[PDB]
Amino acid sequence: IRPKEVYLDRKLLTLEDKELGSGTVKKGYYQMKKVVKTVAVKILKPALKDELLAEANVMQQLDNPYIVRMIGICEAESWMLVMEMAELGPLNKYLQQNRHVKDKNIIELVHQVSMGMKYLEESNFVHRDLAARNVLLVTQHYAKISDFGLSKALRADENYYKAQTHGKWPVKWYAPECINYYKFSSKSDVWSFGVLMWEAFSYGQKPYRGMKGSEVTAMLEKGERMGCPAGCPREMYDLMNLCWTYDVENRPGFAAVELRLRNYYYDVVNHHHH
Numbered sequence: 001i002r003p004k005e006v007y008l009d010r011k012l013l014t015l016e017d018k019e020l021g022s023g024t025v026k027k028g029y030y031q032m033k034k035v036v037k038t039v040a041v042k043i044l045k046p047a048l049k050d051e052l053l054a055e056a057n058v059m060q061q062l063d064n065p066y067i068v069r070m071i072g073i074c075e076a077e078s079w080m081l082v083m084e085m086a087e088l089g090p091l092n093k094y095l096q097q098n099r100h101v102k103d104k105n106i107i108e109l110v111h112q113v114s115m116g117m118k119y120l121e122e123s124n125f126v127h128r129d130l131a132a133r134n135v136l137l138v139t140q141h142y143a144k145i146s147d148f149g150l151s152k153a154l155r156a157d158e159n160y161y162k163a164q165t166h167g168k169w170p171v172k173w174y175a176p177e178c179i180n181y182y183k184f185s186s187k188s189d190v191w192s193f194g195v196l197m198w199e200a201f202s203y204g205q206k207p208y209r210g211m212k213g214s215e216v217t218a219m220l221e222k223g224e225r226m227g228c229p230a231g232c233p234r235e236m237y238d239l240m241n242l243c244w245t246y247d248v249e250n251r252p253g254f255a256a257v258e259l260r261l262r263n264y265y266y267d268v269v270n271h272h273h274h
């Protein structure tokens with residue numbers, strides 16, 4: 001990244017004392033050209049510096065309604081990454097605390113995530129941390145994809161990112177090829193999107209509960225998958241299962257996934273109007 005292009009003035013930023021979550025994320029206020037903009041700011045407490053700047057560099061290149069926009073960066077008390085504020089917070093925590101949210105509403109939100117990911121796929125970026133905790137709600141009917149700290153811009157000549165070693169990975173969201181070959185593609189993100197869908201229809205329950213990472217790998221290798229959440233429409237569980245296709249080449253891309261979700265969402269909108 002070249003800070004010059006996206007550099008913010010610390011004097012124009014006001015940070016809240018409390019933390020939103022955890023570097024650490026805090027609520028803030030940035031004085032824009034005229035309006036004041038409520039922002040979410042990722043702050044640090046050499047390696048961690050480069051990871052934040054890499055995250056900023058990814059976000060800078062993305063421009064989509066369903067992805068959190070970066071406002072800019074600043075080096076003050078630490079390096080800070082200033083982003084759009086999603087006031088209602090992470091999807092998993094929201095659904096845990098709002099069990100009244102309807103099927104149609106959940107379908108709407110996961111469809112928005114699929115539109116964001118279709119865009120990410122078109123742009124040849126891999127997210128590598130697509131989970132309900134990293135989908136943030138602007139409103140009850142507007143979700144954005146966040147948290148690009150593990151995200152990678154794919155090389156012009158390859159469809160995957162090859163990781164050098166097994167780091168601190170959210171293994172329960174990872175496709176077999178991520179675990180077995182360290183290869184991350186948009187198809188690996190589709191696998192993760194399946195788990196995210198399961199989380200959403202389970203009202204933010206953790207996937208594969210009570211199981212170790214190695215036990216999940218063993219379960220998947222036997223062809224076993226998580227069951228249908230209570231009250232989850234069959235069409236949505238069928239889509240989840242398709243996202244959990246073992247063979248990467250036969251697994252659908254986000255274009256196919258988004259189209260399926262889009263069509264089903266219109267069916268449900270029809271059903272509710274009747």
Ligand SMILES: Cc1cccc(Nc2nc(N[C@@H]3CCCC[C@@H]3N)nc3c2C(=O)NC3)c1
Pocket residue numbers: 020021022025040068083084085086087088089090133134135136146147
């Ligand atoms: C009300 C509320 C509660 C918690 C977080 C947010 N907002 C954001 N959080 C993240 N990242 C955190 C990291 C820790 C786990 C959860 C999230 N994945 N990122 C961005 C926000 C935000 O508003 N814009 C970007 C808002």
